[PDB]
Amino acid sequence: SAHHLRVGIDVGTHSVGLATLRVDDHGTPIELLSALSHIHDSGSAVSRVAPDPLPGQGSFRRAPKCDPEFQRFRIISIVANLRISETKGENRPLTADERRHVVTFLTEDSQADLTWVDVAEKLGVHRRDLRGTRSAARPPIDATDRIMRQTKISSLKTWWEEADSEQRGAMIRYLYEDPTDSECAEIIAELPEEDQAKLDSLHLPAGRAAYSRESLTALSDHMLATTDDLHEARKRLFGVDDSWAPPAEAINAPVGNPSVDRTLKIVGRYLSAVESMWGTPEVIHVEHVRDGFTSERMADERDKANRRRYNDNQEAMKKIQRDYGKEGYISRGDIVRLDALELQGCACLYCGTTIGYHTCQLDHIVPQAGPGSNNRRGNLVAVCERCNRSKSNTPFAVWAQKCGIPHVGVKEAIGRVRGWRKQTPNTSSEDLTRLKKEVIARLRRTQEDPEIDERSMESVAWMANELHHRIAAAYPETTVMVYRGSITAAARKAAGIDSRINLIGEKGRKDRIDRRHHAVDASVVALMEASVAKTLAERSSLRGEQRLTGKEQTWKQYTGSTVGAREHFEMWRGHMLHLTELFNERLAEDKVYVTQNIRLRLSDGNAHTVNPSKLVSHRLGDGLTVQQIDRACTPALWCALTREKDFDEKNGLPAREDRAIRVHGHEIKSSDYIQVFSKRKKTDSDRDETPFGAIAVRGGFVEIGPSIHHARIYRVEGKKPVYAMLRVFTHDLLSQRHGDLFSAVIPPQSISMRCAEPKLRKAITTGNATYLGWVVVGDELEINVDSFTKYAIGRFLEDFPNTTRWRICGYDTNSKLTLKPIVLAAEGLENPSSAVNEIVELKGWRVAINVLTKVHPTVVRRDALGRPRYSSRSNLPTSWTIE
Ligand SMILES: [Mg+2]
Ligand SMILES: [Mg+2]
Ligand SMILES: [Mn+2]
Ligand SMILES: [Mn+2]
Ligand SMILES: [Zn+2]
């Protein structure tokens, strides 16, 4: 019996923090059931898409959500839920005409950021007269269209700007799944090569719709012509009944985006495990990543762009410092006022009078109901003292209607805004155009911005909505929130717990070095309440205001405007404190896990082509050395050479002129030439060159270096017991793909054996090697590192002692494993050593298998919750100690 389970999921670009919390009836955290960081491991085809499940439509393929027709359908169906109250008792739906005007309005600009107050103003009603508003907290947009207009791919964006609906839809369908039309890729091939290269970085809205384009269009057209919502429209158009409902995609249904997809697998599996183990969660909270899990490369692009941002803003602060002799702290208000003055040409936007840096004041065009204001650049203007004093907390249009001040009006103000020009080198006309559009829009506004609520912190990113949809579908008795990525750091600061967590590192650099911080973030998000989300968002808004004034900030004192709000907030701070207690407790138990999936399937995967290296020819009659023989171009050749009666394990094949072997039927004589793999200049000698992983292909050979599936750990029996390993190449398992990979036979003529340690080869051929168990890259080793005080590793342990948990990152040689610390994140190293940087960041800890096994480390295998797995009935990989 469990009262309340709260699950928290902290989405990252390379990780997913996962936490499960138990709280009492009052919300006090009583037990941290789970806390881990899951690190990511970096026509006869399509359509294989499910058909439309609506009756009569089953011959049509379900449309992807990025299809313009789906975006349109989604907007329309959301608008078809909107209601208008003309009388305090009853609420009527929007008429067809109103619906058309609204949908037109919402699709004018996919890039416009609107609230429902905007829609209420378009409709000609008060905001409070508008109902039926995840339930869309904000108005919908054509996400696909916004993406196409924001892409950095010039030519594509241009083409998309240049019309039209049919062409747009066709192109999206082309880019997403269907190569046809023939119009594309002529349009695509016409595009510059650099852009055509960039094309794979384009991330259309993910998801598969429940219906086909045909049905989407039908339902849309219908809902736009009537007062029916989606339910009714389905009944009337298709005949289905009240109970009819389309299935939703599973959480882990692939969307074609690597990081997103592994995130989805992690989330789905975790939630399954949680519900199975402890029961159905009361709450599932998610902190989305903003921004964003489009890629790691695109994320690094956003990071570089953020560098650019930071530096140019810093340059702005410097400019104010040298231009105005500004002393000390330079507010966002000083910066904005200056920018506005330059833009408005030193004139009040409201009345036109001349202003300067001393005389001008900054105003919010539209006031915001309740605490705080909307602090967007587009809601800020430079104003004279008189206009600002007169306007007060009133919207500009309302104020201007009866201010009776000369040259003050919406028309005059918009006229001024249209006159704005760049005034800066290499500044985008795009951003300026957006800015002018926004300003004019707000100049027309006759209603306040809406008060901040519990949804102000909700993420509006497409993938956030899709994730919400999926989890809520999979857990229909559970409330689901997907917040914006800024909420955990806000929460931690506001509760004052950011320095109380016993994580590795010091409080508190920018980036964190302990990978367990994701588990913290998850725990925190699971604890989030509506009232607290509201309060936090308000505190941020206030902070923005006071930052625009430049004066002393008081927002930290704000913990709610009502009594219940402040009660909730204080209570919550108590809960955060308890959660800190629980987390540190669990950290002491070493039960805040750091996990990573291990790869057990064969590489898909080796189909890619490399430039074939030249094979070297040797006259068979001149004899061969063991090294030359071991690099024979085919295993059958190797067999032929080692089968020879005068073959010597040390001296290879002696020179003979009467030699004759048979390789796959063909006869090879002393005067004939056999081929071997070589990485030496052919003008050199390969008599002593040792064998390396390679396969023969058309025109020579290729190296299968990294392409290793697993390593089998053998104990060569002593005397002096000697541990060794066999790196099994993916190539050597293909024939037995459909079987047990870890028990499949690896013959002596295999390239794997031939590339193994000679001692191990000999041990295996003579039944002197004992199979201990297998490992793969990604596997976790628990190691006693007391005996390692020498070299780079020891110097690393001087700074990070008792670092016992390591991950296999590759096989350095045929006898050396490459390890890196699991709990530590390279992205949080502040001026490290050379040893620390070598172990963590660069080469890693490269350690001989014998040396490593001497301390008897343990291969650790973990389940869906991160817990060590020692036995399994499902024949899943279990943990084992290397003895
Ligand atoms: Mg004002
Ligand atoms: Mg306000
Ligand atoms: Mn986060
Ligand atoms: Mn995180
Ligand atoms: Zn003025």
UniProtKB/Swiss-Prot annotation:
Binding site residues for Zn(2+): C348, C351, C384, C387
GO molecular function, one term: DNA binding
Annotated segments matching region PAM-interacting domain (PI): 706-883
Region (RuvC-I): 1-42
Subunit-structure text: Monomer. Binds crRNA and tracrRNA.
Cofactor(s) of this protein: Mg(2+); Mn(2+); Zn(2+)
UniProt-recorded name of the protein: CRISPR-associated endonuclease Cas9
Superkingdom of this protein's organism: Bacteria
Active-site residues, as the UniProt record annotates them: D10 (for ruvc-like nuclease domain), H364 (proton acceptor for hnh nuclease domain)
Biological source species: Actinomyces naeslundii (strain ATCC 12104 / DSM 43013 / CCUG 2238 / JCM 8349 / NCTC 10301 / Howell 279)
Biotechnology: The simplicity of the Cas9-gRNAs RNA-directed DNA endonuclease activity may be used to target and modify a DNA sequence of interest.
Record text about domains: Has 2 endonuclease domains. The discontinuous RuvC-like domain cleaves the target DNA noncomplementary to crRNA while the HNH nuclease domain cleaves the target DNA complementary to crRNA.
GO terms (BP aspect): defense response to virus
PROSITE patterns per the UniProt record, alphabetical: HNH_CAS9
Residues holding Mn(2+) 2: D10, E287
